[PDB]
């Protein structure tokens, strides 16, 4: 059976038979915006993302998918036909398929999202899954807190003995593009600018490799007032060099203390304190030193040891804590997706097309 | 023979041929209470106290029985079931079995409980023996006066001679979870709050360590308003500390003149002196030096001499009191009920199948 | 005299001269939370509720009373200085004041609470009453069982002949936030998202406006799933529009059977009839007939039927009930302090200064 995840910013896919996804790629959507100069069939009406991302400049660029929310399904339908057709060589209708969603999500997304499953791809059967459980599956626990964090939306499930606190689940919509726009705005101050979508994606190359978090952002700040070197230089596509210095860590910083983004919620840490202090009091001994840390937004260096020393210094003394962060941390939602595919005892709970033609949609709901 | 107490609040069991008793654990049920998030066989229907006990949080807590009154009687199957099978690892076809009561109870309760001994575990014999006449075996006299107190109930049983007189004894149903519950009332005084099934369980451990009963109620009053040092800090399973002050003793100083209860009965003192003064002026000289503590709700310091300077300060003068607190009360009851197994005597005593399948379920009261 | 509810959520006061209060606002107290662009006097460092709520968007809000503790006296402080100083224009030293509490509450609440009324207004007497039994004196009987319930609090007193039962009394921390958190958790449902504290208080409004408690959910889902109309529009500030549908009841579902929150105790229903239970067998059928509800989340339509039926349904038949609801609920509570203050005999029980100056603050516990 076929595993996708259309989590934000991108897809993932592959057989639930591996371990690793097969196609990994910016699920962007893109146009061109001129009209044609030369005579050929070169210019298609549409490019998908590993082409979109190659041509980009001559296209603009949309994401279908925002906050985890689908904001255009024309665009979603195409995506997935690519997926299916150009890239796994695989007819939908063969194999059952599993989709990954965010937590809390406004119920129609699922309504509509089992209706095309059904209704055009003609798939055999389906299921939604949420990524922070699926999650679990890829390290094999089966009690701890589990923290997702990707593009445009966080979130964290408490389990414990494989059962959720439904009501100790939070979104915090700040990651993501919520956070790449902050190195653009910030970045201005050197005098580089930055405008618009195809050329947003190079701030977002930039931050994917010369970013990381302060193990305390007042040293650090003092430090790079001071006239120590700490700056890289970096080269644009063009040839223009590029260098940033005393900003690598200012701008994660806003992850945490968000004021800087204007919102004024609780930031990471406290909201995993205060997800756990929503658990009952015997749990919370044993979800501390299980904090897992998922999604690839997870992967500066350096969270993990600031992550343990605020929590430490926050929660009540006395509490061993020990953050799971394992590698490879980039793959371990569709990981887990694998694994629960393969388990036999799970395939009854697939939707058939039985149930669909009794209840339609809704039936997502049981 | 197999020697089990169901006694509220804790069953007791073992092999007669022995000193102490095998297993002792609490014998709650306790049942899942959210649907289910991850694959498996963890959560069974349900957990019996030895684990219900240990996952608390995600479950609920339940007592089948209160106030020495069995609530539903599927649910003491389940926990003689794991008794038989899993714990003392014996077919109960083999061995005969005895069972401590409450001296009142409604007689219903009898009739049903041998029922299910023959009927479904067909054994091969039973008998109902009262708590206070096997506390006697313990001692091994033959006369004195027997003080038990368990969770939810006291009772008093005179005996002299090794005769009872059945016109004496008293039930007051003071002790235990109704002692408990006014720690919970009243440690929201300092702010700390309790709610539900599993969190009680901390709140009766506290009782369990952490109690005393005042030489005098009014002086230690006095003595803990001072700024004198009394309090005791106790850690939470989250690590959250509590301090308890001027409450170790205002817990079980309820126990007697038990209108902080709301009760307006007599208290513990009051019964064992209303109790003697039933009996016949030529039996009291011979019952007072030998008041008899037992069960576990006596395991308070300070009991012995509150209650002893009590009845001294009751009684008529010129008359020697001795309060015979053994340790092992805990278990009093059932090394009681290990030594009358035992007794060749007593062999001819048993109930057997032919009774039960003469007379019926009334053959209990022989 | 002066008279004030500090209940949760929201402050009301008068002189003990009338039928009602003349001012009620929120008690929010809010702060700016940017540097100002621009020169003048108009920002002062805090605002309280009525400029609060209107200026709210750039404040942030705390309430300083949260399940009727006090958790920063520096902001109450703030809150009765506004209300002696700026809303009532009176000096505090002419008059005495009572003030309302929460039946169980920490006693070093009441310390700090008449240390304040002393030892900073100098004002000249003070008397802290509960807030159920003031509600009785509205309504002038004297026998009955009051159910009040307000931001955050719910709790009942039974009172027979003008004696309560204090070991009758239950506290239950289910109301108010607790319930306003999930039509926020549910309101997300439909896409829309409401995250800060400035936010919360449209949907508070909303729940101020659209609300009512279905006579059975049962029907009343299986209704709303069908394509009957019964959704409504609301309006947002900006002209946003709002539907509301099949949720309008679900909302104040979760008062009853409240699950839905993940607490596990009983709902308000349950722990009104087993505060009965722990009453004498005959005070019931005075109470009964007499359930007297009070406070401001008694406001919903609706709540009479079904309080009458669940209570119909598990007491014993051929006893009578009636519930007494009365209009102006809202003010019931402080309508009865009024009348308290206004009972000549009743003028010998405050506290006065010579008092607080032998005993202190704790000569509240008499
Ligand atoms: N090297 C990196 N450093 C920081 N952030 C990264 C890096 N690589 C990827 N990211 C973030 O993670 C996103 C990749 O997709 P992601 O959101 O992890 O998928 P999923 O939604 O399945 O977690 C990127 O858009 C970027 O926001
Ligand atoms: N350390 C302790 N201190 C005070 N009370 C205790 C302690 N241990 C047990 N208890 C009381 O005794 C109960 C244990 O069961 P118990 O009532 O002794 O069984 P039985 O009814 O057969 O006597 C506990 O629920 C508690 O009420
Ligand atoms: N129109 C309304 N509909 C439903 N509930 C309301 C309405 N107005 C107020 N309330 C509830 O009552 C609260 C107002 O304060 P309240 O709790 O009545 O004070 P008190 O604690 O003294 O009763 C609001 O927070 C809300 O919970």
Request: aromatic share 8%; glycine share 8%.
């Amino acid at each position: 059976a076929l595993v996708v995840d259309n989590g934000s910013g991108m897809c993932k896919a592959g057989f639930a038979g591996d371990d690793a996804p097969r196609a990994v790629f910016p699920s962007i959507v893109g146009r061109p915006r001129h009209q044609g100069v030369m005579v050929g069939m070169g210019q298609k009406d549409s490019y998908v993302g590993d082409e979109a991302q190659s041509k980009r400049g001559i296209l603009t660029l949309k994401y279908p998918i925002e906050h985890g929310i689908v904001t255009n399904w024309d665009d979603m339908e195409k995506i997935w036909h690519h997926t299916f057709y150009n890239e796994l060589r695989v007819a939908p209708e063969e194999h059952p398929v599993l989709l990954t969603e965010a937590p809390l999500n406004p119920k129609a997304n699922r309504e509509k999202m089992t209706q095309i499953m059904f209704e055009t791809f003609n798939t055999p059967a389906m299921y939604v899954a949420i990524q922070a459980v699926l999650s679990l599956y890829a390290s094999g626990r089966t009690t701890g807190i589990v923290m997702d964090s990707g593009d445009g939306v966080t979130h964290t499930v408490p389990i414990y003995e494989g059962y959720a606190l439904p009501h100790a689940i939070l979104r915090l919509d700040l990651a993501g593009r919520d956070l790449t726009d902050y190195l653009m705005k910030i970045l201005t101050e050197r005098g580089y600018s930055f405008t618009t979508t195809a050329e947003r994606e190079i701030v977002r190359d930039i931050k994917e490799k010369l970013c990381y978090v302060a193990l305390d952002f007042e040293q650090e700040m003092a430090t790079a007032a001071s006239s120590s070197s700490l700056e890289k230089s970096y080269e644009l596509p063009d040839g223009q060099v590029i260098t940033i210095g005393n900003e690598r860590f200012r701008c994660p910083e806003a992850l945490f203390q968000p004021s800087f983004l204007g919102m004024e919620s609780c930031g990471i840490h406290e909201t995993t304190f205060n997800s756990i202090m929503k658990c009952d009091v015997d749990i919370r001994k044993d979800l501390y030193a299980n904090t897992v840390l998922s999604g690839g937004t997870t992967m500066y260096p350096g969270i993990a040891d600031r992550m343990q020393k605020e929590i430490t210094a926050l929660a009540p003394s006395t509490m061993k804590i020990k953050i799971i962060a394992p590698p490879e941390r980039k793959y371990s939602v569709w990981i887990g997706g694998s694994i629960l595919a393969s388990l036999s005892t799970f395939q009854q709970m697939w939707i058939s097309k039985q149930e669909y033609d009794e209840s339609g949609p809704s039936i997502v709901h049981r």
